[PDB]
Every structure is written in C-alpha cells, then in structure tokens.
Amino acid sequence: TLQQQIIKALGAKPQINAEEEIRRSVDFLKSYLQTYPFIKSLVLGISGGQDSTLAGKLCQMAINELRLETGNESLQFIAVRLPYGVEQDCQDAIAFIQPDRVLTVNIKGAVLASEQALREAGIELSDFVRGNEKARERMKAQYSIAGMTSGVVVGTDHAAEAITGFFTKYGDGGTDINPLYRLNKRQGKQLLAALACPEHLYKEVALGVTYDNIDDYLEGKNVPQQVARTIENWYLKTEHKRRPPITVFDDFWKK
Ligand SMILES: Nc1ncnc2c1ncn2[C@@H]1O[C@H](COP(=O)(O)OP(=O)(O)OC[C@H]2O[C@@H]([n+]3cccc(C(=O)O)c3)[C@H](O)[C@@H]2O)[C@@H](O)[C@H]1O
Ligand SMILES: [Mg+2]
Numbered sequence: 001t002l003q004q005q006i007i008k009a010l011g012a013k014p015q016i017n018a019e020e021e022i023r024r025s026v027d028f029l030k031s032y033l034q035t036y037p038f039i040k041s042l043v044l045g046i047s048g049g050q051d052s053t054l055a056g057k058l059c060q061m062a063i064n065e066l067r068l069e070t071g072n073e074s075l076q077f078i079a080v081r082l083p084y085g086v087e088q089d090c091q092d093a094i095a096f097i098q099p100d101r102v103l104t105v106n107i108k109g110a111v112l113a114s115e116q117a118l119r120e121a122g123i124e125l126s127d128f129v130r131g132n133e134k135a136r137e138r139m140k141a142q143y144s145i146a147g148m149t150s151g152v153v154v155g156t157d158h159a160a161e162a163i164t165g166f167f168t169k170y171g172d173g174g175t176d177i178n179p180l181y182r183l184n185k186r187q188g189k190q191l192l193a194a195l196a197c198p199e200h201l202y203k204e205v206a207l208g209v210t211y212d213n214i215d216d217y218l219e220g221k222n223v224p225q226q227v228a229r230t231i232e233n234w235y236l237k238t239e240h241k242r243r244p245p246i247t248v249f250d251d252f253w254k255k
Contacts, residue, residue, distance in 0.1 A: 011182040012159045012182060012219070018194035033066060040151065041077070042063060042078065044077070044156075045142055046079045046081055051158065054202075076100040078100070080102075080141065080145060083104070083108075107137045110140075111137050135168035136168060136171045155175025155178040156180055157180065158183045160215060163218065165235075165239075209227055209230050214231060240253075
C-alpha cells in the first residue's frame, strides 16, 4: 500500500520511547559535530512553538554534553528570534531551553524592501506568497549567522510536516541537519513532556485533515479512505520538496 511505502520513506513508527528518542537525536548531533570539528555552533530559529522548542532543547543538551566531554569552551548553541515587526511564549521557551546565546533579528525591514523592489518591477505579492517570502528571509538570516559563527542550521522538519510538504521550499525547509525527522506530531509532544516542558508551550485549515488524522496515518492505523486519499494527494503533489532539483535523469515525476 502507499501508506506502508510512505511510512517507510519517512521512517515513522507506531510507537516510540520518549527518552530513547531524545538520546537518539542528541547523540546524532554530538556525533556530527565530532566528525566535522570545524563546526562551532548550532543555529536554530525559535518561534515559541512545539517544534522549535523541542529542537532547541535537544541542541542545547548536545552542546552542553560535548563541552563537558571534550573541554572545548568555544562550542555554542545560538537561538535566533526572527520576529516580523512586533509573544510571552518565546520568553518561556527561552527560559526552558536556557540557550547559550539569543540573537534577535527583525526581518520586517528586509521583507518590505524585497516587496518594494518587486512592486516597482510590476509584481505585487498576495499575502500567501508574502508568507513564503518571510520564511525565506528567516532562512537567509540563519545562514548568514551560521556563516559568521562557523555553524550549521538546525531544522525542525518532522514526519507530520514532511508527509504533506507543509514547509516553504528553501524557506524553513532550507536547513543543514534535521534532528526531529521521523517523529509525528503527537510523538513530538511526548518528548517535550518527558523533558518537563511547560504544558502551554505545546498545547491550520490549509490541509483538509487534522494532525490526529496525519499522525494516525503515519502510525499505520486504519483511517477513513477519503482521509487517506487527501493525505496521499498532498504527499504525491509535494515530492519535489523532498528531493534535490529535477534533472533529465529523474523519472519519479513520470509516475
Ligand atoms: N559539513 C557540513 N554539513 C552540513 N552543513 C554544512 C556543512 N558544511 C557547511 N554546511 C552549511 O553550508 C554552509 C556553507 O555553504 P554556502 O552557504 O554555499 O557557502 P559556501 O560553500 O562558501 O558558498 C560560497 C562559494 O560558492 C561560490 N558561488 C556562489 C554563488 C554563485 C557563484 C557563481 O559563480 O555564480 C559562485 C562563491 O563564490 C564561493 O566560492 C555553512 O554555513 C553551513 O550552513
Ligand atoms: Mg513546525
């Protein structure tokens, strides 16, 4: 079935052990940094929501352990707040993560500048397209920071978003390493609970399904046929987002 094929492709599991997965992600980040010792920083955009808070906690834990283990005082986790103009949840998230450094970059000025240049050329953006533009400016900011701090950009992509391609191509989807990949939405909550994250930090119509529908599907459960079709429709439609640019050698789009 397509469901079984998708589940395999995304590495999703019906049930996971919170603590064990926490260590799998942390050990992953630690191992990567020890393999590429020129990397001195982990950069992650924080929004005060479930995904970035979970990833952020794991990143700081990885950095904390590597410091104690190697003695390298130069390693650091950089949390980046990227507000558009002018949110107490972000402060709470920060207090929970206890990041080594927090940088605040307001992307409004740049986004308005990009839109003005486009407008003068004859292109007016719809609010929808402006949203992706915002996501890409956030990507740009994080990569500039990584470039100046010898770091890599950590992504928050997970199975529940990868399956529907619910991310901006080269926007929040533009990252270097994704420690949450394989987990579904509710499983991400499990990890946060295990980390004692303040409940309110992890507690939109675009899709024709709910996150419970998506997580159930990813867990291999029997869902109403039309819900399965909707989910698979999104998956098939967004394969280009989960693969490198298309070349004359590719044939996946021909099926
Ligand atoms: N090992 C690793 N594993 C995972 N991620 C890694 C990584 N090393 C770096 N990264 C990530 O990638 C980033 C570095 O890559 P990138 O941002 O490309 O930076 P970089 O590789 O330095 O790209 C710039 C080079 O491309 C040339 N360029 C660019 C564009 C157009 C043209 C032209 O001729 O028209 C030439 C430019 O002249 C220069 O030689 C790092 O900051 C980090 O975010
Ligand atoms: Mg997310």
